Amino acid sequence: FPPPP
Amino acid sequence: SEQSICQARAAVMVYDDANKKWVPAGGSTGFSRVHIYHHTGNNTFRVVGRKIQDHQVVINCAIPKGLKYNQATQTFHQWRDARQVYGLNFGSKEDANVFASAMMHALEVLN
């Protein structure tokens, strides 16, 4: 998954 | 028909792969009231979110069996499908925890 905001 | 099993407040986001940034779902910035709906007859689930202010639908995605729900942080959760990565930036830790609980309940039914 991509990193959070 | 459609039964809501959870109601949480969160800003729905989608990941912009190219710019490596998260962007507001539906291009409408702000929080949404996000529900997990259980279609009793079909025994399927979906996440639906509408902006709290103008009620615009920003997300309407199915929750497939085997879905991997990631709780990146205490207030940001995400999941994906073949086309995009969805993210929920909850208004509070309480909103996040309850939504996570409902998701696990839906997955227990699906898995």
Side-chain angles (χ1 to χ4, degrees):
Chain A
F1 297 84
Chain B
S1 57
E2 287 285 54
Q3 287 290 295
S4 174
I5 61 175
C6 167
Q7 308 81 50
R9 170 170 167 269
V12 185
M13 318 286 274
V14 291
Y15 194 65
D16 182 333
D17 206 305
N19 295 297
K20 298 298 182 299
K21 284 174 163 291
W22 286 90
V23 301
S28 185
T29 298
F31 291 85
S32 290
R33 179 50 58 178
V34 188
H35 296 67
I36 288 181
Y37 282 100
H38 182 193
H39 191 311
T40 70
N42 209 60
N43 197 50
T44 51
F45 301 77
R46 61 173 170 158
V47 181
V48 176
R50 280 175 180 279
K51 299 296 306 302
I52 289 178
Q53 273 192 57
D54 69 3
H55 293 69
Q56 154 120 311
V57 179
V58 294
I59 185 167
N60 173 32
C61 63
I63 298 170
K65 189 175 88 65
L67 182 279
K68 194 154 306 303
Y69 187 75
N70 179 259
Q71 298 182 59
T73 70
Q74 280 174 283
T75 50
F76 190 82
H77 298 178
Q78 61 188 313
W79 72 89
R80 42 177 157 62
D81 57 28
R83 183 176 184 292
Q84 61 221 304
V85 180
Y86 307 85
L88 293 179
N89 193 296
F90 298 87
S92 72
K93 300 168 186 174
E94 173 189 54
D95 281 280
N97 295 328
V98 301
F99 189 89
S101 286
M103 179 61 59
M104 294 304 109
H105 183 280
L107 290 180
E108 175 175 42
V109 175
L110 295 170
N111 296 157

